[PDB]
Write a protein that binds this ligand. Structure first.
Ligand SMILES: CC[C@H](C)[C@H](N)C(=O)N[C@H](C(=O)O)C(C)C
Ligand SMILES: [Hg+2]
Lengths: 220, 56
């Protein structure tokens, strides 16, 4: 991880319920994409954040109207770990709040991506940042993902990161983006701990859902 | 309740949701970080729920 820099990931959202519990991505003025296991009541979306603990004057805090978990989310296998959030009011898109394009195709192994979040910064230990953290990590091959996690990887998941360890997404990062060449290819989802050797992070494969997201946004 | 003695389980998912668990050693309900999935039973949404079910 590193400090992204103020308002440098403009599509990054914090999900707040009295405190930061998850991340998300702005896909348009009124819709956020996040993880299904981030579903809570009383979600407030905070846009334009950097330091989630102080008010820096670029924020928009907007409550959620609707929160739509994928009809086939399996709580147990974590398959279809995707949820949409409709904002009560449309956001004002500016330079510090902008949305992320949805992919036309799926990204191949070895694509380097940006993963961002306010989650834990210690592999083992505890340290929650004030500011946004970023991490450049490659998409891993299906073959290696399935061998890292035998019998747990569905066609809707991918692995990303480093087999060596020390560089990963951690608790607090869920629902947050994995953006590869400007396109939203993943959502931070799960892993066996974090930044452990031979256990990369596991991400929801957003390219499989593009039709669902569009039609759902359209009819809600 | 036997599950009330069990250690807090964050699990594999990466959310940062504050929940409660019974801490036998301290004789009270304490907060921990729950990752958002595969919860075990020593995991409550309020102290009051925790105390009602576990407080012994
Ligand atoms: C994805 C946001 C950042 C990179 C996460 N929360 C983080 O700080 N991870 C640490 C690392 O430096 O990669 C830690 C070792 C898991
Ligand atoms: Hg961690």
């Amino acid at each position: 991880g590193y400090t992204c820099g103020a308002n440098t990931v403009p599509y990054q959202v914090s999900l707040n319920s009295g405190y930061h519990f998850c991340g998300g991505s702005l896909i348009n003025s009124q819709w956020v994409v996040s993880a299904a296991h981030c579903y809570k009541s009383g979600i407030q979306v905070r846009l334009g954040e950097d330091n989630i603990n102080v008010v820096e004057g670029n924020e928009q805090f907007i409550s959620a109207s609707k929160s739509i978990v994928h009809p086939s989310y399996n709580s147990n296998t974590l398959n279809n770990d995707i949820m949409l959030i409709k904002l009560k009011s449309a956001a004002s898109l500016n330079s510090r709040v902008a949305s992320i394009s949805l992919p036309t195709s799926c990204a191949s192994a070895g694509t380097q991506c940006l993963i961002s979040g306010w989650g834990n910064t210690k592999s083992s230990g505890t340290s929650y940042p004030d500011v946004l953290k970023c991490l450049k990590a490659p998409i891993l091959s299906d073959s290696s993902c399935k061998s890292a996690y035998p019998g747990q990887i569905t066609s809707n998941m991918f692995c990303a990161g480093y087999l060596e360890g020390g560089k990963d997404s951690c608790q607090g990062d869920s629902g947050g983006p994995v953006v590869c060449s400007g396109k939203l290819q993943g959502i931070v989802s799960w892993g066996s701990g974090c930044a452990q050797k031979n256990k990369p992070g596991v991400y929801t494969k957003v390219c499989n859902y593009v039709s669902w997201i569009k039609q759902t946004i359209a009819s809600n | 309740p036997d599950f009330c003695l069990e250690p807090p389980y964050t699990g594999p998912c990466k959310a940062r949701i504050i929940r409660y668990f019974y801490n036998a050693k301290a004789g009270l309900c304490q907060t921990f970080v729950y990752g958002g999935c595969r919860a075990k039973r020593n995991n409550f949404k309020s102290a009051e729920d925790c105390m009602r079910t576990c407080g012994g």
